[PDB]
Design a protein around this motif. Structure first.
Motif, PDB file in Angstrom:
ATOM      1  N   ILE A  59       2.051   0.935 -41.569  1.00  0.00           N
ATOM      2  CA  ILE A  59       1.232   0.354 -40.650  1.00  0.00           C
ATOM      3  C   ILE A  59      -0.058   0.816 -40.520  1.00  0.00           C
ATOM      4  O   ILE A  59      -1.209   0.018 -40.598  1.00  0.00           O
ATOM      5  N   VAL A  69      -5.053  -1.656 -40.146  1.00  0.00           N
ATOM      6  CA  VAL A  69      -3.884  -1.786 -39.269  1.00  0.00           C
ATOM      7  C   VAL A  69      -2.881  -2.886 -39.750  1.00  0.00           C
ATOM      8  O   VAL A  69      -3.430  -3.914 -39.507  1.00  0.00           O
ATOM      9  N   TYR A  70      -1.673  -2.749 -40.499  1.00  0.00           N
ATOM     10  CA  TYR A  70      -1.097  -3.803 -40.965  1.00  0.00           C
ATOM     11  C   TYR A  70      -1.801  -4.334 -42.253  1.00  0.00           C
ATOM     12  O   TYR A  70      -2.788  -5.105 -42.228  1.00  0.00           O
ATOM     13  N   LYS A  72       2.376  -8.743 -40.096  1.00  0.00           N
ATOM     14  CA  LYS A  72       1.510  -8.314 -38.888  1.00  0.00           C
ATOM     15  C   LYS A  72       1.785  -9.090 -37.592  1.00  0.00           C
ATOM     16  O   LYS A  72       2.077 -10.482 -37.516  1.00  0.00           O
ATOM     17  N   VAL A  75      -1.372 -11.056 -31.845  1.00  0.00           N
ATOM     18  CA  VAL A  75      -2.035 -10.309 -30.981  1.00  0.00           C
ATOM     19  C   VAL A  75      -1.347  -9.997 -29.486  1.00  0.00           C
ATOM     20  O   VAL A  75      -0.963 -10.791 -28.838  1.00  0.00           O
ATOM     21  N   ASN A  80      -1.237  -4.295 -33.086  1.00  0.00           N
ATOM     22  CA  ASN A  80      -2.139  -5.389 -33.273  1.00  0.00           C
ATOM     23  C   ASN A  80      -2.626  -5.775 -31.726  1.00  0.00           C
ATOM     24  O   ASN A  80      -2.370  -7.075 -31.504  1.00  0.00           O
ATOM     25  N   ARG A  81      -3.251  -5.099 -31.251  1.00  0.00           N
ATOM     26  CA  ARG A  81      -3.350  -5.422 -29.840  1.00  0.00           C
ATOM     27  C   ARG A  81      -4.936  -4.124 -29.294  1.00  0.00           C
ATOM     28  O   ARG A  81      -5.578  -3.802 -30.207  1.00  0.00           O
ATOM     29  N   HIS A 143      -7.955  -6.590 -31.594  1.00  0.00           N
ATOM     30  CA  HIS A 143      -6.955  -6.760 -32.652  1.00  0.00           C
ATOM     31  C   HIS A 143      -7.473  -6.444 -34.175  1.00  0.00           C
ATOM     32  O   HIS A 143      -8.726  -5.973 -34.077  1.00  0.00           O
ATOM     33  N   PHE A 144      -6.750  -6.448 -34.966  1.00  0.00           N
ATOM     34  CA  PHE A 144      -6.952  -5.882 -36.302  1.00  0.00           C
ATOM     35  C   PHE A 144      -6.517  -6.926 -37.297  1.00  0.00           C
ATOM     36  O   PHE A 144      -5.172  -7.429 -37.258  1.00  0.00           O
ATOM     37  N   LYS A 146      -9.835  -5.785 -40.133  1.00  0.00           N
ATOM     38  CA  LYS A 146     -10.379  -4.281 -40.721  1.00  0.00           C
ATOM     39  C   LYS A 146     -11.647  -4.061 -40.291  1.00  0.00           C
ATOM     40  O   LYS A 146     -12.268  -5.114 -40.062  1.00  0.00           O
TER      41      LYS A 146
END
Length: 151
Positions: A59, A69-70, A72, A75, A80-81, A143-144, A146
């Motif tokens: 991850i 991150v990821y 996925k 959110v 993923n937050r 979130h992600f 990149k």
């Protein structure tokens, strides 16, 4: 069930303490969580985070001047937050000597942090600060996604 083996990576609470923190239900929930890679960067998650069964190796990817991150969940779920990302050792290169520029005075003169804040805006992140001493670029994310600098 929480996996993190990549050399240089660590968590807070430490991976060594996760077994103890895990509850009778097998859930490992920590209040405030950080995962980082020494010398590269870290990601801080405020609040309760359920690390149960997370393969952190797959991850989380922190490299020089970038984070993923990821490679996925929705959110708000998993990692993923909302979080605060810190990328360390982020310094520009002297065009002539081709050596890194760590001088705070020079970094100020070229408004290096201005360049970093601009990138954060483009990436939808909220720039927080740049600490010249360690080349630490801090920005908050929702979130992600990149993030990072593509020199």
């Amino acid at each position: 069930g929480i996996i993190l083996t990549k050399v240089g990576y660590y968590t807070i609470p430490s991976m060594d303490d996760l077994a103890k923190i895990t509850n009778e239900k097998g859930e490992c929930i920590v209040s405030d969580f950080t995962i980082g890679r020494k010398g590269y960067g870290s990601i801080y998650f405020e609040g309760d985070v359920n690390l149960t069964n997370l393969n952190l190796d797959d991850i989380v990817h922190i490299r020089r001047k970038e984070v993923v991150v990821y490679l996925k969940p929705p959110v708000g779920e998993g990692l993923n937050r909302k979080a605060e990302v810190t990328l360390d050792g982020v310094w520009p290169t002297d065009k002539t000597s081709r050596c890194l520029i760590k001088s705070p005075d020079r970094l100020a003169d070229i408004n290096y942090e201005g360049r970093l804040e601009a990138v954060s805006r483009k990436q939808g992140a909220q720039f927080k600060e740049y600490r010249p001493e360690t080349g630490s670029w801090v920005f908050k994310v929702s979130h992600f996604a990149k993030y990072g600098l593509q020199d």
